[model samples]
Target: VREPQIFFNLTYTEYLDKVAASHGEPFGEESRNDRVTQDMLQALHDLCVERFGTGYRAVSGLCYTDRRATRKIECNKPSVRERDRSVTRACPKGQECTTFNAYNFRNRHHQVTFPVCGPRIEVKDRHDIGIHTEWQGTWYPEGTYDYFAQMAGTLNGYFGYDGVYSDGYKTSSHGYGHSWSCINCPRGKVTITNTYRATWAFGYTSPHS
Candidate 1:
């Protein structure tokens, strides 16, 4: 899907320049009635309609977050060994203990078990536009860190997951992080459908009918 173009015009540039120059000027004295240049306003409106769909207005600069469950290690087991005779081991010179038995030794090794929850998909209409589409399937139950990592890698060049972060990071901007916007539809009418795959153990997990 094609993305909406960002509007740019000489007046818009001029307005930006004025704002920059007003940094040292009195706020109340600054001209707030600066007329929207015809060419610039039209270009901005056209770009808005093309990108955000018709009736595109101010975004209100609002944003939110959608959290999804990820796979996590739920349990762990220690490694075990079977020996015919009991053995003793001497402690190193700097160690506290002088000697210890095999059974008395604590198991330092551990095994991690995968979680049982399946993948999940979420749909969001941030701008209230009615555009609908499906986001391709991805590995599920994986933590947000891994999921977003894969998402960034796979959808890199696409308009949706481009490096630019509209919804800024927590420390930088007070908006949702790692969110996607519709490239084809307006900001309001976009719908996202996520598909998640079930985890399998040894290829023995049964598929749903």
Candidate 2:
């Protein structure tokens, strides 16, 4: 359910090109100099800084104010099956987790992106959840799905395992009408519990809202 991944390992100018290739220009070529277009461009830059703990700078004039991330964020590690499968209990089996600080945003221009404030979801007990993967960088949309749902599944998968992480990756914001690959996937549905909800916002609103 995750969005198509884009790797950012280029200079600032090429970064813009990469973004356009995947998400289109902030407002397309005709409106490159528009105020909202600049805002959207700046927001994309800010999102990259937030996700990767680094910022890119072009050599010359750019419409939006260049920014650098104020703090460095630690990304999660991947080492599967790190939890005790022997728990054999509800609530503590690391089965009912969710994603927090995950929000899909649409500015007034209606350009989309998913910004997850924290790279990892919060679990009451780390050992309870096991070794799930983490995705770094801003989330851009691809394929055929609502951008938010794709991101929710991406985050939820990091806390889930096996069938739930793979075939059962579908998720919803309000926890309804889920379609899973297997009937018993709810046992590993990571988007079904407290302190780990994924949210979305529109038109310059904060994801914290």
Candidate 3:
């Protein structure tokens, strides 16, 4: 199913950029409003139709969680449910964590396992092989995203896992200090994703599923 010559016409990274605004941005940060760029939006439309045989709304984003058969917590990172192009399993059945304040055990606090590689794929943005990304629909590819590549490595280093958001892309900006990996940076971890809406995965209240 691999096409040679590398077709760069319509790419996933391109799709991501248009919708979320530049892969180099901050994973939907440059375009937080979820603004549908021409390429990304259309790609999603076509992708959704092709996948679920339905609508764009039907297309689920990176389902980085496996909190099922029980409760919940941070449901933003890549979960065991998402094994590459694998079947997107059900999200942890519980309250969807949407708070940004002190503590909301209701939203977070759940049983979940992250996706580790018994069969490592080495998360490289879209594909382990490094797919051609537009970096926010640059109108042309500038090579695999440096931001995502570095972020993935950084996340893997600290989290001891591959891929970007295996459990969560916590920090807002993608950099070293974001994770414990940035020990030298000396600043602090950047909060990615919606810190306010982010969920806590502390083994505090929820049970492992």
Candidate 4:
């Protein structure tokens, strides 16, 4: 027979208390619904279960981000500050601050990559996706998938994918099209996987589109 046991840790309680202390006053003053606390506690419980299994002694440290403020932590090249400044200044009037055109910004450094394109229904066809582009020299199709997975991982931090994230559009704009390309390709293999979503409002089709 398996042993049956339950465990409790002060660290978990302390973390909960800390979160409550931070939000309690504002919530109380605003007369907010108790659902806030309930939801937070439930999230904590879920995290514990996810990290530690149903029948184990587990203690975990907590890390959090302030969503209301810009992310100060930097991980990518060109630095977040430099990228933000370049994108903002380069975008022309009437275009979104995020827009980029190859004619103006030929340098790869200036543009943002998108992962997927269009709404879920609009880009259902294989041709409508942007993973099918011809690449050359060490740019294998498999390599493209690996690169895309890495980008998707970053976006996952802010938004969940599928049913996990808020709306499944979290990593939708990370690639030029709805997908990425490879660097080296075999002579006979198809180089490009052109599966990008079409531009709806701008009449601008994806470069791969």
- List lDDT for all candidates, in order: 0.21, 0.25, 0.22, 0.21
Candidate 1: Cα lDDT at 19: 29
Candidate 4, TM-score vs. the true structure?
0.15
Indicate the residue-level lDDT of 89 in model 1.
23
TM-score of each: 0.15, 0.19, 0.21, 0.15
lDDT per residue (tens digit) for residues 53-116 in model 4: 4421111112222332111111112212332211001122222111111101122233222111
Q: Please, what's the RMSD in Å of model 2?
A: 19.2
Which predicted model would earn the best TM-score? 3
List model 2 lDDT by residue over 83-173, tens digit each: 2111011122211222122112222343322221212223233222355422322222111221121233323322121222354555322
Best by lDDT: 2
C-alpha lDDT (0 to 100) for residue 173 of candidate 3: 27
Model 4's alpha-carbon lDDT is 0.21
Tell me the number of clashing residue pairs for each predicted model: 10, 1, 16, 28
- Screening candidate 2 with a backbone cut-off below 3 angstroms (N, C-alpha, C), the clashing residue pairs are 97-190
Give lDDT tens digits, candidate 3, residues 100-121.
1111111233312222111111
- Model 2 error, position 56 (Å): 26
Q: Any runs in candidate 3 off by more than 4 Å, and if so which? A: 1-43, 52-62, 66-146, 149-176, 179-209
Model 2 TM-score, 2 decimals: 0.19
Off by over 4 Å in 1: 1-107, 116-118, 122-159, 162-209
> The CA-based lDDT of model 2 is what?
0.25
